[PDB]
Amino acid sequence: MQLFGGRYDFEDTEVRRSNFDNFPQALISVFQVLTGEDWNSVMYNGIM
Amino acid sequence: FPSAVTIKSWVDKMQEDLVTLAKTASGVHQLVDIYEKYQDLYTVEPNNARQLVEIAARDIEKLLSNRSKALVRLALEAEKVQAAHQWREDFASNEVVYYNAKDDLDPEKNDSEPGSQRIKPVFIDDANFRRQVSYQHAAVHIPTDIYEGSTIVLNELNWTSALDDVFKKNREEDPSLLWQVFGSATGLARYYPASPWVDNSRTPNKIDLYDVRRRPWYIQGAASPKDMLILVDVSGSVSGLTLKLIRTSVSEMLETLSDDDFVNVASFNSNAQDVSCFQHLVQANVRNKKVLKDAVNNITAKGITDYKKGFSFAFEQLLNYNVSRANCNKIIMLFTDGGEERAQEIFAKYNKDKKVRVFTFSVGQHNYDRGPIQWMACENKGYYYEIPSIGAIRINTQEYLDVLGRPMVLAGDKAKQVQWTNVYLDALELGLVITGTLPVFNITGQFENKTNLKNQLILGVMGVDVSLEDIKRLTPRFTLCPNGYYFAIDPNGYVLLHPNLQPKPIGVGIPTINLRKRRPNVQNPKSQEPVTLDFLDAELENDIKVEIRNKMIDGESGEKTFRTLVKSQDERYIDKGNRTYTWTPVNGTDYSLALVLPTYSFYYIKAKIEETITQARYSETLKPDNFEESGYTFLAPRDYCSDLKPSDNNTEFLLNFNEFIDRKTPNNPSCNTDLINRVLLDAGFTNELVQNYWSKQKNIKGVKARFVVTDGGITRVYPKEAGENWQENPETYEDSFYKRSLDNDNYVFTAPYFNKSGPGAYESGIMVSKAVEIYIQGKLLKPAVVGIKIDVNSWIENFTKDCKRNSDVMDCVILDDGGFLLMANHDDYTNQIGRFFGEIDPSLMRHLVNISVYAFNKSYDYQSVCEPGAASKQSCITEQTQYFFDNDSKSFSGVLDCGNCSRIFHVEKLMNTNLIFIMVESKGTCPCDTRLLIQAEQTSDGPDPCDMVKQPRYRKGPDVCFDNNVLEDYTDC
């Protein structure tokens, strides 16, 4: 929530549902990266 | 260097040669005398410039009244037919049979959509619409992304089915009638007669983006003018998708504004500021909206959101009253995403009486609270819209006109006044049209007062197109000389009728296309704006024209005779001519009509040839076979009879005209007998000249061709082999040399074109021309223009005989007023004859401008075709320059110092023509150069509008205004 909170503000129209905008969404994102599923796209959003 | 006397005698002999050659070989005096020797085949009739304007104003008022009376029929029928509608929801059994425009005419498709059935029309081809049209039913257009088959759409195609018999009745009572349209508040457009749309959506690849609700006539007839202030949220929370959507939304919202509306875009984030250079409400014309769009597209998001600052800024912007405004509909449009502040303090402090509306827009897909935004909307008589994606922008940014129209509905018949639009380009390719509009009200439960809930909005707008060529026929210009013309004006400056108004769109700025960011098959949008060209941007601008403009904007009748600068047809020269403007107001409407006549055009010639002997003899004179004795003949492609049409192939048209004139003797019960009588008398006179005088000396030494171009529409060139080099328009009212020679009282030399692909330098020659000038019974008249093509070689060999071929001590050239090279001395200059002198020796040209032998004037052409810059052809503004003679002095001796150098020169004006001789120390002497002096349309961007707003042109606004009704509802948001 500190590193990527309110930072996925890319001007394109593609929807990025796994973000860190609030606490329940950050929980969901961290749990999904824990299960291993699609964690690389979360990482790519974090890099961009 | 020669003395003044030797140069003066040189140019005296040099000009005597040319003037005597042209005077004795053209035949000005012979033609003057054969015009004056008859005096009984015609009569000299006056041109009463007041009676003409009043008659034309009455015909225009009658036309617009006949078009107003066909709108109050359609509005009444629509209201009565919809009031008695039942609103079923079961159509799949009782179909709706209609013709959907932009559906393919293939008979082997058989769509038969659920709940509806199609019509396959016959589509005869008509005139007054250059397309195939069916007068049997009305066509229906439904926007591409609006499903046809809804219960809102099928309930509209049901009750609108009764307009067809009123469409037919209107058309049969006055067959001159163009499109009649009903544009619905649901997106439908039902028009008559039926005709397939220009763009099927996906039947071909090109899709169409046409919504009736964004058309100028619809917006103009749906609500009164506005004072819009767009308040944009540029705090940090909007960065990303919602800022991009806000930019697109503000652009699409600006595209719903007209020239009677006023706008400014502000922007707030912990601080409110104007987003542009404007600082207050501006007039919302195409240039101001261009500025506002370019300023919006540069917005970046950062900071804290402070609604109180932004709303204070907005309410203080809407209180100026020092600037020009509309003073009808004060509204604020807040584009935001979501917040927690509602700012009740500011609303109570600033619009406690609720004279200002508020429309709020929540843009993007976000997680913020929207309650306060809807509260701001529901409290201040406004409305609340949500824009989650790009697809919602169009329909959500054009819907506030629904709220703005409640006070107009609540006024009843006080609010049903016809309105006429700006000039714009018909969507069905009819050229420039204006449209008369009328809003249709919803009256269900009107004589028992039941509902008043859905009855607060209009059903749509009824419109009827009037083409500008229908108005250009009530102002006939063929009794005025080529220099006189009618023109009409808005109460806004804009021009409804002018020789300089073209079917092209008005350009703004310099076009800039990117080639690395355009997919091949994406179907870019094109344009939707009207052709609003001010009166001061169509002509040259004095300070007397400004006062004439302002004097006939506020409905005054008057007359003024003065002296002005007129630009030539080919925008290369400028003339100092006397003009007379006589203006009046068009009584029924708010247009004003003026007529511009040059004195020497107060009398015209009216033919009086009614003897079949002379008529048939004169008609014999123009048949191609006999050309070898009368010279190649051109005829003006006017409308002499309703049968034959101007074919634009002049031999085609000439043979058609001949076989028409002989196939039916000049009785012609339905032709225009005055035009054909003038043509016949004219051809008789011109053939008399060609036979009696020109044919005696078959060839002259220096002459290459001899032409007569006259009023009536006759052009004659004596050697047929010269008729192949005639490049002039066959309509004598577009011939630039004709209108130029009418103004001057001497011989006019036209300069050929440079680097022109075709015979234009040596095969043709240099054109001299002079206007024929007769006095019948004490009345001046200029009915024709004779001329000559001078051979370049003969002129050179008379010119050389200190100036010898390719001499390297001095250059001796001849230019005209305009700075174009006509007779050089170097075989390197003389190969580029007809080129601007500031392009082959800029230093002396700039010095000549400085020493006041040449003056120049700069103008803007707002309708130009342009090659897109680096950032097929687009529309742009071009700057034009024209040079002429200001000082009437004859000699100019001097010396120019290039720095380190000096070159002595003498210039002398050949009197009785428009030519000037310059002898200067050779450029080869000194290695000096600064930069070229170009005389050509330079694609420009100015003028700068941030400055025009601080001193804007005078303008009158509409005085009917329907807002602020006390029994509105505003329980909707």
Coordinates of N, CA and C in Angstrom, one line a residue, chain B residues 704-769:
Chain B
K704 N 0.3 38.4 -81.0 CA 0.2 37.0 -81.1 C -1.3 36.5 -81.0
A705 N -2.1 37.3 -80.4 CA -3.6 37.0 -80.4 C -4.3 38.3 -80.1
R706 N -5.6 38.3 -80.4 CA -6.4 39.4 -80.2 C -7.8 38.9 -79.7
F707 N -8.2 39.4 -78.5 CA -9.4 38.9 -77.9 C -10.3 40.0 -77.5
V708 N -11.6 39.7 -77.5 CA -12.7 40.5 -77.0 C -13.5 39.7 -76.0
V709 N -13.5 40.1 -74.7 CA -14.4 39.5 -73.7 C -15.4 40.5 -73.2
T710 N -16.7 40.2 -73.3 CA -17.7 41.2 -73.1 C -18.7 40.8 -72.1
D711 N -19.5 41.7 -71.7 CA -20.7 41.5 -70.9 C -21.8 40.8 -71.8
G712 N -22.5 39.9 -71.2 CA -23.4 39.1 -72.0 C -22.8 37.6 -72.1
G713 N -21.5 37.5 -72.2 CA -20.9 36.2 -72.1 C -20.2 35.7 -73.4
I714 N -19.8 36.7 -74.2 CA -19.1 36.3 -75.5 C -17.6 36.6 -75.3
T715 N -16.8 35.5 -75.6 CA -15.4 35.7 -75.8 C -15.0 35.3 -77.2
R716 N -14.2 36.1 -77.9 CA -13.8 35.9 -79.2 C -12.3 36.1 -79.4
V717 N -11.6 35.1 -79.9 CA -10.1 35.2 -80.2 C -10.0 35.1 -81.7
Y718 N -9.3 36.0 -82.4 CA -9.3 36.0 -83.9 C -8.7 34.8 -84.5
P719 N -7.4 34.5 -84.3 CA -6.8 33.3 -84.9 C -7.3 32.1 -84.2
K720 N -8.0 31.2 -84.8 CA -8.4 30.0 -84.2 C -7.3 29.2 -83.5
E721 N -6.1 29.3 -84.1 CA -4.9 28.6 -83.6 C -4.5 29.3 -82.3
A722 N -5.0 30.5 -82.0 CA -4.8 31.1 -80.7 C -5.8 30.7 -79.7
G723 N -7.0 30.3 -80.1 CA -8.0 29.9 -79.2 C -7.7 28.6 -78.4
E724 N -6.6 27.9 -78.9 CA -6.1 26.8 -78.1 C -5.3 27.2 -76.9
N725 N -4.9 28.4 -76.8 CA -4.1 28.9 -75.7 C -4.8 29.8 -74.8
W726 N -6.2 29.8 -74.9 CA -7.0 30.6 -74.0 C -7.2 29.9 -72.7
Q727 N -6.7 30.4 -71.6 CA -6.8 29.7 -70.3 C -7.9 30.4 -69.4
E728 N -8.6 31.4 -69.9 CA -9.5 32.1 -69.0 C -10.8 31.4 -68.9
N729 N -11.5 31.7 -67.7 CA -12.8 31.2 -67.5 C -13.7 31.7 -68.7
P730 N -14.6 30.8 -69.1 CA -15.5 31.2 -70.2 C -16.6 32.1 -69.7
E731 N -16.9 32.1 -68.3 CA -17.8 33.1 -67.7 C -17.1 34.4 -67.5
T732 N -17.6 35.4 -68.2 CA -16.8 36.7 -68.2 C -16.8 37.4 -66.8
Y733 N -17.6 36.9 -65.8 CA -17.6 37.5 -64.5 C -16.5 36.9 -63.6
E734 N -15.8 35.9 -64.0 CA -14.7 35.4 -63.3 C -13.3 35.8 -63.9
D735 N -13.3 36.4 -65.1 CA -12.1 36.8 -65.7 C -11.4 37.9 -64.9
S736 N -10.3 37.5 -64.3 CA -9.6 38.5 -63.5 C -9.2 39.7 -64.2
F737 N -8.7 39.5 -65.5 CA -8.3 40.7 -66.3 C -9.4 41.6 -66.6
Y738 N -10.6 41.1 -66.8 CA -11.8 41.9 -67.1 C -12.1 42.8 -65.9
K739 N -12.2 42.3 -64.7 CA -12.5 43.1 -63.6 C -11.3 44.1 -63.2
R740 N -10.1 43.7 -63.6 CA -9.0 44.6 -63.3 C -9.0 45.7 -64.3
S741 N -9.3 45.5 -65.6 CA -9.3 46.5 -66.6 C -10.5 47.4 -66.5
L742 N -11.6 47.0 -65.9 CA -12.7 47.9 -65.6 C -12.4 48.9 -64.6
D743 N -11.5 48.6 -63.6 CA -11.2 49.6 -62.6 C -10.2 50.7 -63.1
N744 N -9.2 50.3 -63.8 CA -8.2 51.2 -64.3 C -8.7 51.9 -65.5
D745 N -8.2 53.1 -65.8 CA -8.6 53.9 -66.9 C -7.4 54.0 -68.0
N746 N -6.7 52.9 -68.0 CA -5.5 52.8 -68.9 C -5.3 51.3 -69.3
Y747 N -4.2 51.0 -69.8 CA -3.9 49.6 -70.3 C -3.4 48.8 -69.1
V748 N -3.9 47.6 -68.9 CA -3.5 46.7 -67.8 C -2.7 45.6 -68.4
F749 N -1.5 45.4 -67.9 CA -0.7 44.2 -68.3 C -0.8 43.1 -67.2
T750 N -1.2 41.9 -67.7 CA -1.3 40.8 -66.8 C 0.0 40.0 -66.9
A751 N 0.5 39.6 -65.7 CA 1.8 38.8 -65.7 C 1.5 37.3 -65.8
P752 N 2.2 36.6 -66.6 CA 1.9 35.1 -66.7 C 2.3 34.4 -65.4
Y753 N 2.1 33.1 -65.3 CA 2.5 32.4 -64.2 C 3.9 31.8 -64.4
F754 N 4.6 31.5 -63.3 CA 6.0 31.0 -63.3 C 6.0 29.5 -62.9
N755 N 6.8 28.8 -63.6 CA 6.9 27.3 -63.4 C 5.5 26.7 -63.6
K756 N 4.7 27.2 -64.5 CA 3.4 26.7 -64.7 C 3.4 25.6 -65.8
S757 N 2.9 24.4 -65.4 CA 2.9 23.3 -66.3 C 1.9 23.5 -67.5
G758 N 2.4 24.0 -68.6 CA 1.6 24.4 -69.7 C 2.2 25.5 -70.5
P759 N 1.6 25.8 -71.6 CA 2.1 27.0 -72.4 C 1.7 28.3 -71.8
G760 N 2.6 29.0 -71.2 CA 2.3 30.2 -70.5 C 3.4 31.3 -70.5
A761 N 4.5 31.0 -71.2 CA 5.5 32.0 -71.2 C 5.8 32.6 -72.6
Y762 N 6.1 31.7 -73.6 CA 6.5 32.2 -74.9 C 5.5 31.9 -76.0
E763 N 4.8 30.7 -75.9 CA 3.8 30.3 -76.9 C 2.6 31.3 -76.9
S764 N 2.3 31.8 -75.7 CA 1.1 32.7 -75.6 C 1.4 34.1 -75.7
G765 N 2.2 34.7 -74.8 CA 2.6 36.1 -74.8 C 2.1 36.7 -73.5
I766 N 2.4 38.1 -73.5 CA 2.0 38.9 -72.4 C 0.7 39.6 -72.7
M767 N -0.3 39.5 -71.8 CA -1.6 40.0 -72.1 C -1.8 41.5 -71.7
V768 N -2.2 42.3 -72.7 CA -2.6 43.6 -72.5 C -4.1 43.7 -72.6
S769 N -4.7 44.6 -71.8 CA -6.2 44.7 -72.0 C -6.6 46.1 -71.6

